[PDB]
Symmetry: D2
Subunit: 296 residues, 4 copies
C-alpha cells in the first residue's frame, strides 16, 4: 500500500545565502542535482535540513519549492515535526496542499512526554496530513527519546503510519522491527552503517551524505541484491572515509562545502550557532568534491 | 555590579486559553500574584514557560506584557534562548526594548555544538542585549548538554555574564562554582533540593513550583540565614511532598491546575503534546490549592 | 533498634606493603588512628578498602584484624559484598564470628540481575549474618545499578536491614528516603556533598576522606545541629578543596599518601592496576598532611 | 602471524552441579560437544563462563580441564581478566602452562582507571602470558568502560596483542577498526548482529549462543563468503528468534537449560545471584532443544 516509499532518499540540506537567509535558487539546483543522481525520493526539512533553526514560514517555503521541482519525478517526504503538535499539524497540512507523498515527524523532544502523548502527537499530525502516510522518525542520539521495540511496534501500527525512519545504530532492534513487520518500509538512518543496516532488515535509507555520493549507497543496495558481499563492504569503506572527514569538519557544513565545490550551492553556510568551516579543512574538502565528480 | 539579580524568582508559566492561545488576562493576573507573594523577580519565557512550543512573536508578546505589569516592581529576567542564535538575538533585543533587567539563554540543544560555538552563541546574544547582563542557563537533563566545571568557568566569566541558572542536582559542582566565583549570582534550579543547593553555594533560586508556594522557599532562605536547620528541612520536606504530586500528575499542568483552583488562571491547559490532567488527580490538586491558600 | 549504627564512619583503606601484600602492622595503626579521631565506627572491606582486588581470605584477614583492634570501642561494619552470593555469605558468616556489629553489601554488579535476584541476594547474606543487621550499599556510579526509590523502599524494609549507605548525589532521592523511613539509618556516601546530604535527610556518613580529616565532618554535623549554617559551609568548602586535589592525584592513593606523611601507613601503595602517585603531586600531598596535623 | 586465531568460537559456559560446584564431567562433555559442532576454537572463563562468580583456583581448574580435552584439536583462548592485574597475571601464566594458544582480558572495571593504567594492565598480563598473544576484550555494556577508537587503536597495537574481541553494537566503530588494522583478528561479540558485524569488518566471532547452534553462525560466514545475502539474513533471523527467547528467560541459564535438554549438561544451574529458570519457560526451552537437534 506504501511500497512506493521504499528506496534511497537524501536528507535534503537547506541552502542559505551569505546573510543566512534561505537561498532559493541554490535550493532548486540542489533538488535537481539529487534527482539527477538517481535517488528514489527526497526528505525535506529534516534534521539535516536545519529545520530547528528555521521558522514555520521558512520550512513551508522550502517544502513548496521542493514540491515545485520534484513532484511527480521522485518521491516527496516532508518532515513536519516540531515539539509543538499544532506547529507540526500546520506543516503537515501545508505538505498535503503542496502535493507531498508522505509526512514525517521526529519524536517531540526537550520536554519529557509520556508514550501516550507521543502516540496522540502522531495521530494529530496524521489527521492534518489528510490522507498521505506518516513516516515515524526515531533519532535517539539527538531527540533524547529512546523508544523500546514494543513502543516502536505501537507507533508503526498506528492507522496512517506507512514507514519508519530508524536513525539508530542498534541493528538488533533493526532486525526485530523487520521480523515483526515484514512489509514495513524501514529506512536506515546512519549512513556509516548503511550496508550493515540493510543486511539487518532495512529496505532503504534516508541520509545526509547521500547529497554528495548517492550512487555509492545505490551501489551498496545493488551489490547486496546481486550477492557481491565484497563490493558492498568496499563501497561502505569508502563512504566511511568520507564520513570520518565530515565528522572532523562538521557534517552539515562539510556537505554544503562539498556541494559548493561541485557548483551546486552558491554559499555553504549553516545557520548560527553552527560555525563556518575552518580554513585548514578547505583543501581536503575541495579534493573530495573533485574526487566525487570524477568518480561519476 | 549585578547583586540586584540575587534572590528567589518563579519560573513563570505561560497561561493559555481553552483553544491553547495565549491567555493575556490570566498572564497579567499571574504576574501580580507572584509579585504579591514577595518574590525578588520573575523569569519569563523559560522551560517552565513552555517557550519551545511557542513562536517568537508569542514569546515577545509575553515578555512585553510581563514588563508592563512588573517593571520597576520586581527584577525582570527574560529567557531569550532558542537553538538559533539569530532567533535568540531577536528576543534579546526585544527584552532590552521592553525594559528587562537581564536576559538568559539555555545552552542550544538538539544539534551537537562545540564549546566554542556555545561561547560564540552567548557572545552574540549578549551583544544584542545591548547592555543588560546575561544569565547562563544550564539544564543538562533537558538540553542534553553536560557542561564541565571548566566550561562553566569560561561561560560565567564572559564579558556580560552576570549570573548562572544552575538546574543540576550535582551539588559538588554547585560548591565548586561558588568557590571559584565567590561573587557570582548562582540560582538553584531544582526546587526539590533547594535547601541543600543553598547550603552548597547557591545564593538564590529560579523554580517552577515557586508560582504556587514561594513563601516556603523564601522561608527556607530565612531559616538558613537564621540558623534554624530544622525549619529548613521541614519546609523542604513539605515542598517535596508537593513536588512528588506534581511529578505524578505532570508538573506544568499540575501547577497551572493549582493556580486555577487558586483563582489565578482561568484555564490550566498546557500546549499539546502535553495532555490535560487526568480526572483522578483533580481532587488532590484542589485540596492542595486550598491547603496552600490557608497556609498563607 | 539499630540507632547504634548512626554516625560518622571512615571507609577504611586497606594498607599494602612494598610488594602489594596486606600490611598488617599499618592496618592496625590505621584502625587506632581512626578511633583516636573520634569516629563513631569503621566500614571495612568496602570500595575504598580495595575489596575487589583482594581475595576472600585477604578480606577475612582484614576483617578479623580490625575487629581485634576496634571491637567494643567503635561500631564495626563489615562490607561483605561480592558479585557471588555464596562468596558474600562466606564473608558475612566470618564477620559474625569476628564480632562485627553489622554487615553491608554493594548491589551485585557486572552482570545484570533482576530486582528479585538482588532482593534474594540480600536475604541470603542476611541469613548468613546470623542476627547482625545489614547495611544496603547503593553506589550507582561504580556498580552500574541505578535503583529506583520504590526498589530502595523494598530493600530497606527487608527483615534484617538496618541501614542504607547512600552513595548517590541525588539529594531529592535522599530526602524521599528519609521521608518514607523516618527512623532509617541513612549514611551520606559522597563526602563532597556531606553537609548538603545531611540537610536532605542523611543522619550520618561513610566516607573515604574521613580517614585523614574526620574532625571536619564531625564538625559539620555539630555546626548543623547548633544552627551554624556558615560554619558548615566553610568546613565543606575546605573538605572539597582537599577532594579536588585527591581527585587530581587519585583518591585512594592520595589518601594513603597523606596518611603515609602523617606516619600512619608505612607504604602508600594501591594494588595494580592503580598506578602510584605521580612525583609532581608529592609536594602538595605532604603539605596537605602537615596542614591537617597542625589543624588538630 | 596470528591468523590462526580467526574464526567462530563459543564463549564457553562453566557447568555447575546441583550444589553450584564446578561439574567437571559435564564441562568435559561440553568441550567435546562444541568441538563436534565444527567450531574453530573455544573461549574459556569469559563473561559467559561466569568467571566473576568463581575463584582463581576454580577458573584455573576450568582452564586446565578444557586444555586437556581440546589442545591440538581447536584453538584455545583463555580469558584471564580480573579487576586485579596480579590476579590476571596468575591466570595468564597458568594458561601458558596449560598450553593455551592465547589469553584475553576484559577491561578492568568497577573502579575508574586511566587509559595508561589500562594499557599497563594489558602489558603486565602480556608479560605473564610468556609469548602467547593477547585478545583485548571490549564489552562496554557490562564493564562500564567505553573505549574510543584512538584508545582501541593504541591497545591493539601493543606488542603482544593479536586480536580484539569487540562486544559492541556500534558497527561504525567496527568498520573503523577494520579499516585502520586490515590484518587484525576482530571478533564480533554480539551474536544478535553477527551477520551485520561481519559485513562491517569482523572476520570472526566469539559468542555465548554458539554453544547450542554454532552451525548457524558458521552458515552465516559461508553465506556471506558465497554471496548468498538472503541466506545470511534468514539464518540471522532464526538466530535472533532464539536470542529473543534466551533474553526473556535469562541468557546463561537458558543456554545451560537447552544444553541440558540436549544431554550435554547434567545440571543447568547458574551461580547465585542468578535465579533458576522459571517453570513456565521450560516447555519452550525443551522444544527449542529438540528443534536444534533435528535441525542438524
Ligand atoms: Cl539547476
Ligand atoms: Cl513559492
Ligand atoms: Cl517515553
Ligand atoms: Cl497507543
Ligand atoms: Cl489581577
Ligand atoms: Cl502589548
Ligand atoms: Cl560541548
Ligand atoms: Cl572561550
Ligand atoms: Cl599504633
Ligand atoms: Cl589474625
Ligand atoms: Cl534492576
Ligand atoms: Cl521483594
Ligand atoms: Cl563426552
Ligand atoms: Cl585436572
Ligand atoms: Cl578510560
Ligand atoms: Cl600507551
Ligand atoms: Na548553505
Ligand atoms: Na520513489
Ligand atoms: Na527519537
Ligand atoms: Na542512511
Ligand atoms: Na494555561
Ligand atoms: Na529583585
Ligand atoms: Na544545559
Ligand atoms: Na529551585
Ligand atoms: Na598502602
Ligand atoms: Na558507634
Ligand atoms: Na548500586
Ligand atoms: Na560521605
Ligand atoms: Na550448569
Ligand atoms: Na582454530
Ligand atoms: Na569494555
Ligand atoms: Na557474536
Amino acid at each position: 500500500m506504501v511500497s512506493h516509499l521504499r528506496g534511497v532518499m537524501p536528507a535534503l540540506l537547506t541552502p542559505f545565502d551569505a546573510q543566512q537567509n534561505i537561498d532559493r535558487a541554490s535550493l532548486r539546483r540542489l533538488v535537481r542535482f539529487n534527482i539527477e543522481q538517481g535517488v528514489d525520493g527526497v526528505y525535506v526539512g529534516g534534521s539535516t535540513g536545519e529545520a530547528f533553526v528555521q521558522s514555520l514560514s521558512e520550512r513551508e517555503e522550502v517544502l513548496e519549492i521542493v514540491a515545485e521541482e520534484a513532484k511527480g519525478k521522485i518521491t516527496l517526504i516532508a518532515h513536519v515535526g516540531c515539539v509543538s503538535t499544532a506547529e507540526s499539524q500546520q506543516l503537515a497540512a501545508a505538505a498535503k496542499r503542496y502535493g507531498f507523498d508522505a509526512v514525517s515527524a521526529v519524536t517531540p523532544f526537550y520536554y519529557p512526554f509520556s508514550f501516550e502523548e507521543h502516540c496522540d502527537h502522531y495521530r494529530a499530525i496524521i489527521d492534518s496530513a489528510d490522507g498521505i502516510p506518516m513516516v515515524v522518525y526515531n533519532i535517539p542520539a539527538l531527540s533524547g527519546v529512546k523508544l523500546t521495540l514494543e513502543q516502536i511496534n505501537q507507533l508503526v501500527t498506528l492507522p496512517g503510519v506507512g514507514a519508519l525512519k530508524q536513525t539508530s545504530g542498534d541493528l538488533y532492534q533493526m532486525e526485530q522491527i523487520r521480523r515483526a513487520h515484514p512489509e514495513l518500509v524501514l529506512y536506515n538512518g546512519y549512513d556509516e552503517i548503511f550496508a550493515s543496516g540493510l543486511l539487518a532488515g532495512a529496505d532503504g535509507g534516508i541520509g545526509s551524505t547521500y547529497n554528495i555520493m548517492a550512487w555509492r549507497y545505490l551501489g551498496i543496495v545493488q551489490a547486496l541484491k546481486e550477492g557481491d558481499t565484497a563490493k558492498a563492504q568496499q563501497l561502505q569503506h569508502e563512504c566511511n572515509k568520507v564520513i570520518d572527514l565530515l565528522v572532523k569538519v562538521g557534517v552539515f557544513r562539510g556537505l554544503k562545502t562539498v556541494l559548493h565545490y561541485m557548483d551546486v550551492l552558491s554559499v555553504p553556510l549553516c545557520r548560527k550557532p553552527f560555525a563556518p568551516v575552518e580554513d585548514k579543512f578547505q583543501a581536503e574538502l575541495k579534493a573530495l568534491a573533485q574526487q566525487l565528480m570524477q568518480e561519476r
